[PDB]
RNA sequence: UUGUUUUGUU
């Protein structure tokens, strides 16, 4: 079943699709999105986004495989992934 | 004399004039600024602007009638207006 | 500047 998780420690540079590209090594991914400040031009990155999978498994595969696991190039802190707020 | 205000909550397809129409029924308009995302190509509108009328009694009427109060077509929230920062 | 967006103030 689809499960929309928080994933955050992103770099300001990466889109939708540099993201998918991410994800979509774990499973199936229904919809990436970037949370920009809608203030600048572009809007820019707030540096995270939320993704949704079409199945929990992939979730969590991807949760244990990222979550306090991987650094992105650029970025001070591992990827923060877990189930979000909404 | 010249106050500016902001105004927030219009459509993304109304233009400089289309605004004007509007707020020009309280008074004489000064300038509209429409900002635009010129990255963006066309330049998009961001959906808010900067309209400065040539008195205050009127950017008050203006004010008093329209933050909060109408709702511009399409919209999912009333126009927001107050003076400029 | 760990951020859970659509309120946008050139």
């Known amino acids: 079943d689809a499960?929309?998780?928080f994933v955050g420690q992103?770099?300001?540079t990466w889109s939708?699709?540099?993201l998918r590209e991410l994800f979509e090594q774990y499973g199936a991914?229904?919809?990436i999105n970037v949370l920009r400040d809608r203030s600048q031009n572009p809007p820019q990155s707030k540096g995270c986004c939320f993704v949704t999978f079409?199945?929990?498994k992939a979730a969590?595969?991807?949760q244990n495989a990222l979550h306090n696991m991987k650094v992105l190039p650029g970025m001070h802190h591992?990827?923060?992934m877990k189930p979000?707020?909404?």
């Open 3 to 5: 499960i929309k998780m």
């Open 10 to 12: 992103v770099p300001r």
């Open 16 to 18: 939708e699709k540099d």
């Open 29 to 31: 991914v229904y919809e």
């Open 54 to 56: 079409y199945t929990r």
């Open 60 to 62: 969590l595969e991807a």
């Open 78 to 80: 591992p990827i923060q």
């Open 84 to 86: 979000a707020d909404s």
